[PDB]
Symmetry: C7
Subunit: 166 residues, 7 copies
């Protein structure tokens, strides 16, 4: 029953390792069953599925997809706050928060990075599209190149809604 | 006394290792004795008895069978929710929830069947007799669950078959897909 | 003070290792002292004193005997429920529950197994026959015969032999 | 712990060095909690040997300390033998309040420097209401009792059923 | 739920290792959600990202920056107290406390030490500037040389506000 | 905050290892600050600084001395009860309880040891520390047993063992406990 | 939230290792925030930064200095009690308690043993013992041991407890 949980806070402070998806989902389910429409605050500082240029989760995509799915299943709105970084699947995750409720701090940085590969790669494009309110085509183009955003850049691209200053 | 339990939630987030069956059953028995007809919510994201192409439970079938049997024994209805995946014995498990109460999310994936029944050169051999008995009980469970004849099921199991949510709903492994 | 205990449930999910008898007895004593006449629910899925063909308890018989003795000493009735298996001493244990209160699920399986260091070793093999007899309401002779061969039961078989009373369904 | 709350002490193991400390601490605690309320000491133990190996070199002196405290406190101690009381465990079982020493049907019992060997004879004697001589004789040979045998020898008072 | 936390105290007694930023942030978030405008007391004795002349955090700068950002995000005022030392990123941290509420003891000591490395080095200059009320130029000049302060020196430079006594 | 502590009981069941002095003192301080004049019950069954004939504390003397000092500092009276044994420093400790309140059971045994200091491998002029130490221990036993420093230093030349009654006559103990 | 802490007691029973300073300070801060002007009791038995002739803290001086600084910062008075020994930085620490409230037991022993730092330590001892910086720097040239009474005359301590 940890502390932050009591405040309806979930803080992802690490790369998303295999066991992380399990934890985040358990916490969402728990919070949802505790109070039905109370908001949940998901704080994110993460490099996604890579750490020091090494892939630390081979399931990263499918894992993040599970999270967003649950995020969409529950009645409680999830707000997101990017503290340091949201890269790769962390960025996908950050942008899946309730529209209008996706936040970042001033200095935050963002990045976007056999019918299994196919079905999966399609679902992620589809998620980013709905999130950023763009066509599937323009997104699949953006993904061809590694693209980094700063807070303001991210707000224009519609990954984020507001910047929290002072 | 964990959290999720207080809410009558059981969340299977891993492959089903030997110790997992014991946990799930303990939790079902506990919940049943706590409140007699209150529903129980079983959330499932699992690859069954395999992890990274390695069998992590040699008892997987008989284990899952034990769970379903208790699920059928208790008075509390068990609802099931597939969150990422239910493969192999996890699929059998997901589909054993109360009919009309078996759920999945949009992107969930399902898969049938099995395994290696692997018999090491330690050995009994009454053994392997229980495997005929066992392979029959699982067909029988899937049949009752999906409302199909034992024959058509034994055919479906000859080939590894993957479902998406909608596919799984037509095959009658699942009842509803959850949205907001 | 675990959970299931709070509900008067004892769940034996393993082979019966040396430390298991101690646990089950402590729990029985505890529950008895907590509420005198309230029933106790003993759930059993176990292969007894063997695991993967290896004997994991050299004391298994005497140990189970101690359990049943306490089971008979306390005022609280003990109900038994077999969930996967009761083999060997686990079967002896399952059948020692209150008559009419010994339960099994549909797919459960049961099995019964075969100086002064003699005059009392003999003493043990006799007590076990005597227990099965009282449990299954059969004569000491018929039982000692049944024990000459490894005999497996399914639920219904076990009910006829009077190891069990009822089979549970919804 | 649990069992303590009920004034139960359960010795389920051989008596290792650290066991004497525990039993005494629990007796003291229970005595200070409620002065004349009974204490229930359940015993299933092989004493100072485990799988034919001596696991306590202090076993005798240790058990003696226990009985001494048992005699010091005002709370009566009842004893219940559940599987076995062998060696020092038997000495221990028999030191419970007379009329309050119990055993189950299938329980088994066994009896196994100069100043010390004398105190142990003296304890068994007082317990079983026998002369120091007849006891020192009984100790020359390893002697095993069943419940009924133990009741006649006056190590135990009653056998529990119901 | 530790002790000092109950008193709204956060005590950084070590170099700032990778896991330290996570802890400090978690604690700020927690305290903020517990009582909105109640002050938070951040005690600092630290050598920053170096320990025995070895860098113990390769992320030290970006990490401290995350901290100050949250410090600026939350409504609760953070007071700072330097107890032995604030060096490097610890000094940057100490000085980011609410103006007028930045404290030190008598014998305390202070020290200041592509699109990425450049962007970062700029944000750190920008933070010190705002903190010490000086122009970006004069700060970048001070940073060319390792400069040590004692309490009084630090108060004049406007890293600190008051020196504590009895 | 363990159990026995709640009852103002301190039970030394072992040889006195280095960490034991710290525990006993902590407990005395705690009990003293909890209730100012309420008695404290110190139960002792111990072989002192030796176990199996091996010295398990090189600081044993100075350690026990620290305890007795605190025992004399606090306002709460300390009663002592010897259960099995008090040997060496444990005997010194048992006898330091409040006069009239030092107890033993019938079968308890006591011993005083030709006290000693132990030397390392590897400083210097700790002579002031050792001669000084052997003297403080004689001084404590004397005050406790109401005897002159001379007669005590003699008794210490030979290992002497007492039974309960012997210990009561020597004035190490006050009373023997019975039913 | 340990026990002694509940009674506003801090007990330093060891050499002062690197992690010790952190603990003592945390405890002071905690006690200060708990009750503002209630006294704090710091019991000291310690050899300072050396153990068995080996330096166990390379930061010992600066560490103790931090402690005394906090001791002077907080409103709660700190009393000190030397049980066995205060050597080196432990002695500096013992003497920093509130004047009139620095205590020792009968048998306690005391001992006193980069440019900026060595100066601050002289300055602290001076204020504590009410002596001039010069006479102190002289005393430090030689290792000097005190007994309780000696320490009271030198004004490291106020009273001896009996």
């Amino acid at each position: 029953p940890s502390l932050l949980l009591s405040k309806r806070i979930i803080f992802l402070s690490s790369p998303i390792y295999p066991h992380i998806s399990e934890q985040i989902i358990s916490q969402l389910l728990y919070l949802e069953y505790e109070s039905k429409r109370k908001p949940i605050h998901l704080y994110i500082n993460s490099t996604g599925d890579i750490d020091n240029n090494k892939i630390i989760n081979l399931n990263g995509i499918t894992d993040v997809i599970s999270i967003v799915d649950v995020i969409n299943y529950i009645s409680s709105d999830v707000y997101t706050y990017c503290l340091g970084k949201a890269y790769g699947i962390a960025c996908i995750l950050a942008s899946s928060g309730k529209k209008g409720y996706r936040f970042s701090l001033k200095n935050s940085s963002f990045c976007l990075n056999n019918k299994e590969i196919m079905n999966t790669k399609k679902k992620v494009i589809e998620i980013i599209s709905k999130n950023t309110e763009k066509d599937t085509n323009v997104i699949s183009n953006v993904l061809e190149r590694d693209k980094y955003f700063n807070a303001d850049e991210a707000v224009d691209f519609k990954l984020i809604d507001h910047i929290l200053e002072k």
